[PDB]
């Protein structure tokens, strides 16, 4: 009560005293010090009786409101709070330990919330308002931010901050979730590290993108990666990642930038690895060429249930490309370009597994030949219906990519991992 | 710290002192002199305690930021920097000695970087912005530039400067680098000498232009060769070469002289070989007419990955040229005009070699039938990661262009080359 009234009076006095532009001229620390001095002077003038703790709290709150993110700052500073979700000025939720909880934190009004959202997004040069109500951003520290303006959000501006939790998308999660056995995990690490061209095929709900992030986690830091996605969800930890996002056509059907355009441009940016979020149309062709003409180590997810169907769908995509390529030419391209196909699927019980790790070996007999390094053998189901299976290595001790592993010095690791698969 | 703060203060004072538009209206010399004078006056007023060298550096930086290319200027001035990549306002990498290194150079912000990129791409009459987020160009100094706008490049505008390198070869160089077997070299010499219509297709990084330059050494010196280019990259050593260069449209959208107009004029320049630096527009149609109306021996570089893909690309180009030509008519024209397609591509290991030497032998029904003379067969990889392969002749003894060889007496050499690599 008294603290709130004192804060309101001090804020009014400071606003009447210092303009927003003048404070913006000063840096975060210089502006903060100047605001602290002005607030002390205003408190002395108003003869407000406040203790050291109360005075410090009021000064910090005034500084945060005038400069910074206001009532959000205490939440952001906390480490336990993984995600913050503000639905209008009068409600805030925090995700602690995987559970969402309501918090007493409340903004002054929707106007202050909009100002704070605009500052947060502008921290990376983006702006959100009625003209562009939807804004999405990734702050340099890894926090994702999503903001919806009042014209779309009926109850007020909506803000969603998801801080960078690091453990979610590493091989440990897959190994402990029985998605891939530890030997399979080591084989995948070798495949990713040795710049093997990959095509992650997966069925509906098979978590293809999660597997793609986990695989790209192996990329060497120095490699200049370029990611094309319809909607940015990959979170490469590397220092030299370029992120691109397609653009759908406007309501007039113009101004579009399809994934094919992004891949063709990627060819002209000197990338050492092209990652395609999801191949759906002609872009496959371009992507495949990117694999063939250097850039070895690219990747791309695809919608298919088995590796053979994945190859067939790649052929159909390239054919959709419109070029008069004979089927034999397309098969030769695929055989020469793609090196490993990872088939991940969602089984009956809803669990996710890496059903196959297979290698495109050649074009014997005008039909592409694939040898499976790892397969998932379904033995049975638990008493409660849960499916039961195990990862078996086919025993191919010399995968066609063995030469790359030897070149990169990972041949010993590959042999050790694939030998003890059992 | 002190230097950065002084530079920021000087920039703010200069911005508040002179309008950007007025300086832009000023000429290079006048603008530079005014900027230097204003910077010196501001430094004197603010009493910046720095050496004369420090003042000169500050003035140069202010001039570059106001009208130059910002922090890229020291990078561009350098020589060891093979190329520069900007992944955003706060990420700049340079390829020094073939190694990518993160430079301690940062732009003021994303807006400044976007303005710098817009200036650079406007230097050759092109605009990059939300409406045209992707812009690839070639600067006068020979360097290639690629720019992606924020709407696609999520992390901010992305820039890529790849500086020019000579990279010119002679057929002996290609033979010694195994780019083409000696029999292939003889066959290519025969094809070039006998004024056989050529289309040197190749993928990105294949150096197709270098291959075209190498091919234009078997031309009879007497033949009047007219080379139409976009940046003057060909260095023909023949004595009667007329070098033409297209003029990109000015920022106002006028004064454009497209390659199509250059070729159409060349039709009336009495040439014997219309050489096109790169076919990427409707000009192909006209070029084909030149190929099929007495200017035998015309060559044209094209961007395609396989001879069939090159043919399809040419057909699509002619169709997009805006004419009412039925697809069957365009295919018939292509079959009649073109006589040899040389496919130069970069292999996965980064090396570049000639893959196909294919004649457009005829048209059946709707599909164009073509026969390969020389084909590159790959045989895996070696210990050092280099691709292992060899060229083999298809065994044809009477190639379609045989008559042309008979014209110049090159029948014997053609037969010997086709026999020695059976």
């Amino acid at each position: 009560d008294y603290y709130h009234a004192t804060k309101t009076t001090i804020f009014n006095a400071l606003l009447n005293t210092i303009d927003l532009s003048q404070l913006a001229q000063l840096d975060l620390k210089q502006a903060g010090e100047e605001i602290r001095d002005i607030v002390a002077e205003l408190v002395a003038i108003k003869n407000v009786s406040m203790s050291v703790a109360e005075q410090e709290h009021l000064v910090q709150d005034i500084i945060n409101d005038v400069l910074g993110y206001g009532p959000l700052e205490p939440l952001l500073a906390r480490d336990d709070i993984a995600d913050i979700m503000v639905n209008g000025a009068h409600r805030v939720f925090i995700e602690v330990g995987g559970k969402v909880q309501l918090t007493n934190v409340r903004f002054r009004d929707n106007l202050q919330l909009m100002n704070i959202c605009q500052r947060i997004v502008s921290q990376v040069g983006r702006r959100v308002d009625e003209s562009s109500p939807i804004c999405d951003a990734r702050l340099p520290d890894g926090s994702r931010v999503n903001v919806i303006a009042p014209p779309l959000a009926l109850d007020g501006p909506t803000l969603t901050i998801r801080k960078f939790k690091k453990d979610k998308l590493t091989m440990k999660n897959l190994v402990e979730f029985a998605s891939i056995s530890p030997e399979g995990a080591r084989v995948l690490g070798v495949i990713g590290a040795c710049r093997c061209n990959l095509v992650i095929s997966g069925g509906t709900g098979s978590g293809k993108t999660t597997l793609l992030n986990t695989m790209t986690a192996f990329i060497d830091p120095t490699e200049r990666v370029v990611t094309c996605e319809d909607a940015a969800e990959l979170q490469l930890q590397q220092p030299h990642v370029v992120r691109l996002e397609t653009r759908p056509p406007n309501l007039e059907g113009s101004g579009a930038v399809t994934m094919r355009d992004l891949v063709k441009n990627c060819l002209r940016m000197r990338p050492e690895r092209i990652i395609v979020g999801e191949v759906r149309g002609p872009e496959a062709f371009d992507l495949l060429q990117a694999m063939n003409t250097g850039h070895d180590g690219s990747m791309g997810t695809l919608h298919a249930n088995s590796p053979r169907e994945a190859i067939s769908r790649i052929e159909s995509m390239i054919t959709m490309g419109g070029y008069g390529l004979p089927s034999k030419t397309i098969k030769e391209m695929i055989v020469g370009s793609v090196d490993v196909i990872i088939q991940a699927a969602r089984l009956r019980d809803g669990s996710r597994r890496i059903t196959h790790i297979t290698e495109v070996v050649g074009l014997e007999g005008d039909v592409i030949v694939t040898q499976d390094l790892f397969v998932y053998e379904i033995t049975g189901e638990d008493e409660h219906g849960k499916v039961v299976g195990k990862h078996r290595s086919t025993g191919i001790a010399r995968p066609r990519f063995w030469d790359r592993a030897r070149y990169y010095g990972l041949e010993r690791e590959l042999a050790e991992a694939l030998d003890a698969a059992e």
Side-chain angles (χ1 to χ4, degrees), chain A residues 5 13 24 31-32 40 44 53 68-422:
Chain A
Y69 313 130
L72 283 170
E73 301 289 4
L75 309 180
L76 286 165
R78 285 170 64 170
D79 294 323
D80 53 352
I81 285 168
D83 303 8
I84 300 162
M85 320 178 254
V86 184
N87 320 326
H90 299 299
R91 270 183 132 59
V92 173
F93 291 98
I94 66 178
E95 180 174 292
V96 182
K99 289 177 72 62
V100 179
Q101 325 174 300
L102 177 64
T103 54
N104 59 302
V105 173
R106 275 181 58 268
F107 288 66
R108 203 230 301 141
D109 54 45
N110 285 329
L111 281 300
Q112 191 201 10
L113 173 57
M114 254 307 298
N115 294 353
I116 285 157
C117 261
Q118 270 162 352
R119 282 209 288 279
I120 287 164
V121 297
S122 170
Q123 172 176 320
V124 296
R126 280 181 169 78
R127 45 165 283 282
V128 60
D129 59 53
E130 295 195 38
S131 80
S132 175
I134 294 163
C135 168
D136 188 329
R138 185 180 311 219
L139 314 190
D141 62 17
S143 311
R144 280 165 286 210
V145 171
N146 192 272
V147 174
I148 305 201
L152 296 179
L154 307 178
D155 50 0
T158 73
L159 167 63
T160 302
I161 306 176
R162 295 184 281 161
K163 296 152 71 179
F164 202 83
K165 59 199 76 170
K166 294 180 286 285
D167 63 349
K168 194 152 41 53
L169 293 177
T170 187
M171 289 302 287
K172 305 324 299 167
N173 284 33
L174 297 185
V175 168
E176 84 186 37
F177 292 167
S179 299
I180 187 71
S181 95
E183 305 90 359
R186 293 171 83 182
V187 161
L188 283 175
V190 166
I191 287 167
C194 81
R195 290 188 71 164
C196 269
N197 307 334
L198 270 162
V199 166
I200 300 171
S201 71
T204 183
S206 56
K208 313 189 291 299
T209 292
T210 283
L211 185 54
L212 178 52
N213 272 308
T214 308
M215 286 300 325
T216 66
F218 295 122
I219 270 173
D220 184 291
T222 62
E223 297 177 33
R224 169 171 161 81
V225 186
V226 181
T227 66
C228 318
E229 312 162 88
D230 306 72
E233 301 305 19
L234 301 166
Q235 313 173 90
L236 295 143
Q237 190 58 10
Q238 283 46 19
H240 198 154
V241 177
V242 169
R243 295 166 52 236
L244 309 183
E245 149 148 4
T246 64
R247 189 172 72 185
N250 55 22
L251 61 94
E252 300 78 5
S254 67
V257 181
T258 67
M259 191 86 69
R260 168 150 64 165
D261 315 302
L262 294 194
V263 173
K264 280 200 295 188
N265 199 82
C266 288
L267 292 179
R268 285 201 290 300
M269 328 204 324
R270 196 233 178 271
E272 307 219 35
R273 274 205 197 218
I274 301 189
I275 311 290
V276 174
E278 179 128 321
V279 198
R280 293 210 206 92
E283 58 272 8
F285 173 78
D286 299 279
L287 168 52
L288 266 301
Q289 290 299 346
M291 261 159 276
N292 197 24
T293 42
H295 315 147
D296 57 334
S298 289
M299 305 195 184
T301 80
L302 187 123
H303 190 312
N305 304 265
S306 77
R308 307 217 61 71
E309 185 181 33
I311 287 155
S312 299
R313 278 214 42 62
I314 288 164
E315 290 192 27
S316 297
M317 284 154 127
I318 292 160
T319 296
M320 260 200 273
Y323 319 110
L325 298 155
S327 190
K328 184 158 157 56
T329 290
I330 289 168
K331 288 176 195 287
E332 277 181 10
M333 199 166 49
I334 289 157
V335 163
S337 305
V338 170
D339 282 321
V340 170
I341 291 160
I342 301 166
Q343 183 61 94
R346 187 177 70 176
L347 307 192
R348 181 217 307 160
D349 88 318
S351 63
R352 299 190 170 103
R353 306 288 208 224
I354 287 173
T355 48
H356 304 75
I357 305 172
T358 192
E359 188 186 35
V360 183
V361 83
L363 184 36
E364 277 79 327
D366 199 41
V367 65
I368 298 160
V369 176
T370 57
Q371 67 174 357
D372 313 306
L373 302 189
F374 270 58
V375 287
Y376 193 64
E377 299 292 356
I378 289 158
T379 63
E381 49 278 10
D382 199 351
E383 61 83 28
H384 46 95
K386 179 167 282 291
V387 64
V388 177
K390 69 186 182 78
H391 297 280
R392 181 177 56 74
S393 167
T394 322
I396 305 301
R398 201 70 59 221
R400 195 170 77 89
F401 65 78
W402 170 272
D403 296 307
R404 320 211 91 213
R406 174 166 80 267
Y407 170 40
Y408 281 82
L410 295 160
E411 59 199 326
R412 288 297 314 117
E413 183 71 16
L414 176 54
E416 287 177 14
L418 195 133
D419 185 33
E422 299 192 331

